[PDB]
């Protein structure tokens, strides 16, 4: 009643506060600040449940509705680009503050066990939370064409502006916020369409609510509204040459999620559109060149896990892995970025191209891999180097297994002596060399993160052995002794360019039963002994399945009213021991399967070597006896 009905006065005041930019931005900031709870950034949604109960209003929805209507329609009356950028940034921040304040796991567990197991008392609380929280309205607005059009217009800008702009420029911050909102929407679209739409529809059907739809029924998902924009990927790729770590990581994650989808790649390749869009003015070439220049940039030894360069490298590697693992038979953008001529159900190399001159992304990866040393002195056997090489080897294996990109890759590898570089980069493992300053025999080893690096190193050795065996089989079937001599010399322990290297029998040091990975010390467990891991269990024992059971048991014991305060610490320490027991069992299973895979790879390599061997046997009798001596204790 601002001094005329309230439904009219409120909209009149909102429209009055919409004229201009200063007052609009100030109101948006005020609303964003008010939406923050007093405890800071989970229940008790930050607003009174009786907000607007007197008048026939939907609560706090009108505010978000007006904000979205403004951001969608009145963005053309702003001449000053700075004001428009500030308004878009404020709207994106408001949307993010509204989305981040939504419970996902809570609603999932509710819809799962509340009505099916728990009573119907708390159901009303979750219902009111889902009905009053503005997340549903934001998601509904996200399916509008105006919103995505404004977003892609804001993200589509000239490169000169971003180049001459400052890292703290509002344009970069707005683009980052928009990418984050898009990521959150792509993550929560399924949860919404599953546990919001039906409940809201049922509530609207039962009770009396007057709401105006703002979503498009045709857009069954968020990808339907964005699959019509081809310049988005081009802009995301061009924005990688700016140097901004956060923006680069966001763009890489967005491209990875896009390549991971299915409808987008079904619409693109039902000839194709992306390959021709990225080959308009040589965008792929410059993108590959920028990626190569980036991965070649060194890292900061002190800021191992904080070096933005290493983070960008890992993001690019994850993107390539996700793009190659998805739909390997049909080519993708990864093949074009590597320097291949992506043709319909066929690949090829062009003359004088970047991949022909051995200057491309794949060759850059090969170089940075062969010029990488993991053997250190101060710590020795670092972890992030191991992770990097493991990712590189996974990408190489994904490229090799694909028969569409196997022959050319093997040719390019054998034409540069990659196996020789790998062997020269090999390092022997012993129980004395610690992992990141920590010894293996220590009990904390199974609890520390060194297990991941150990599994990665085992997988790397297995992949190297498999590649060596495949190359040996190829050279044998090709009936050419020009390379067989060098292969045997490398296996004999000599190199003629003589440089010596440890033989294959030297690397047979990963089979050791002294650690007793199978045996586990079982504590007394005077209580909770009957709690098994039935619902916990692909050997993967979930911890929540036992956490809920032990919590229910503790609640029952407390309700029994028999020395509940004293014996609580016993149950607490038993749970703290059981969680580490489960983690140790999982790590032991992982180590066991890794050792099994490595042993299988080594056995296959040895079989391929023994079978395809025309060299005399009397000289190799020494190696035969050595292998027999080495396997004797293993069999025993």
């Amino acid at each position: 009643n601002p001094f005329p009905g309230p439904q009219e006065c409120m909209e009149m005041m909102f429209r009055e506060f919409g004229t201009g930019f200063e007052q609009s931005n100030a109101f948006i900031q005020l609303l964003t600040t008010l939406l923050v709870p007093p405890e800071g950034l989970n229940d008790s949604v930050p607003f009174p449940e009786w907000l607007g109960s007197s008048i026939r209003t939907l609560g706090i929805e009108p505010y978000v509705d007006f904000v979205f209507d403004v951001f969608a329609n009145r963005t053309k009356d702003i001449s000053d680009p700075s004001q428009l950028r500030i308004l878009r940034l404020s709207c994106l921040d408001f949307v993010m503050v509204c989305l981040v304040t939504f419970n996902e796991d809570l609603i999932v567990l509710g819809h799962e066990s509340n009505i099916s197991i728990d009573d119907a008392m708390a159901a009303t609380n979750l219902a009111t939370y889902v009905r009053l929280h503005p997340f549903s309205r934001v998601m509904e607005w996200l399916f509008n064409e105006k919103v995505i059009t404004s977003l892609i217009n804001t993200i589509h800008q000239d490169p000169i502006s971003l180049g001459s702009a400052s890292p703290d420029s509002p344009l970069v911050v707005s683009i980052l916020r928009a990418i984050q909102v898009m990521i959150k929407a792509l993550e929560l679209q399924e949860t919404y369409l599953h546990l919001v739409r039906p409940e809201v529809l049922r509530y609207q059907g039962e009770a009396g609510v007057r709401r105006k739809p703002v979503a498009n029924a045709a857009y069954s998902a968020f990808e339907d509204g964005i699959l019509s924009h081809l310049s988005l990927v081009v802009d995301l790729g061009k924005y990688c040459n700016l140097g901004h770590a956060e923006l680069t990581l966001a763009c890489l994650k967005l491209l990875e999620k896009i390549s991971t989808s299915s409808r987008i790649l079904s619409a693109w390749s039902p000839r194709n559109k992306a390959i021709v869009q990225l080959e308009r003015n040589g965008e792929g070439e410059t993108i590959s060149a920028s990626l190569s220049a980036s991965i070649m940039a060194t890292l900061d030894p002190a800021l191992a896990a904080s070096g933005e360069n290493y983070r960008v490298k890992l993001a690019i590697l994850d993107f390539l892995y996700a793009c190659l693992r998805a739909t390997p038979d049909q080519p993708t953008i990864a093949h074009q970025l590597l320097g291949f001529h992506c043709e319909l159900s066929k690949l090829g190399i062009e003359p004088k191209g970047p991949f022909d001159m051995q200057k491309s992304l794949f060759h850059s990866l090969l170089n940075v891999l062969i010029t990488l040393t993991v053997s250190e002195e101060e710590q020795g056997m670092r972890g992030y180097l191991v992770t990097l090489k493991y990712r590189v080897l996974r990408i190489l294996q994904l490229l090799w297994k694909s028969p569409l990109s196997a022959s050319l890759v093997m040719d390019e590898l054998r034409a540069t002596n990659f196996l020789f570089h790998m062997l020269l980069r090999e390092v022997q493992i012993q129980p004395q060399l610690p992992w990141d300053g920590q010894l293996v025999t220590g009990c904390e080893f199974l609890l520390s993160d060194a297990s991941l690096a150990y599994i990665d190193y085992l997988a790397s050795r297995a992949a190297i052995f498999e590649y060596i065996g495949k190359e040996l089989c190829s050279v044998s079937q090709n009936r050419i002794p020009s390379i067989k001599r060098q292969i045997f010399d490398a296996l004999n322990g000599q190199i003629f360019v003589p440089l010596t290297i440890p033989s294959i029998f030297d690397f047979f040091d990963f089979i050791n039963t002294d650690y007793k990975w199978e045996e586990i010390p079982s504590p007394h467990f005077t209580y909770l002994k009957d709690l098994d891991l039935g619902p916990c269990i692909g050997v993967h024992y979930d911890i929540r399945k036992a956490q809920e059971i032990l919590a229910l048991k503790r609640k029952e014991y407390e309700h029994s009213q028999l020395a509940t305060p004293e014996f609580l610490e016993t149950v607490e320490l038993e749970e703290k021991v059981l969680i580490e027991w489960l983690t140790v069992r999982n790590r032991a299973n992982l180590l066991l399967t890794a050792r099994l895979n490595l042993l299988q790879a080594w056995a296959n390599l040895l079989l391929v070597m023994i079978e395809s061997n025309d060299f005399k046997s009397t000289p190799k009798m020494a190696f035969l006896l050595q292998a027999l001596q080495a396997i004797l204790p293993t069999l025993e």
Binding site: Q358, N417, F420
Partner: peptide, 9 residues
């Protein structure tokens, strides 16, 4: 063609 890929330590 192989400026640095050579095995010349």
């Amino acid at each position: 063609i192989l400026p640095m890929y050579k095995l010349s330590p």
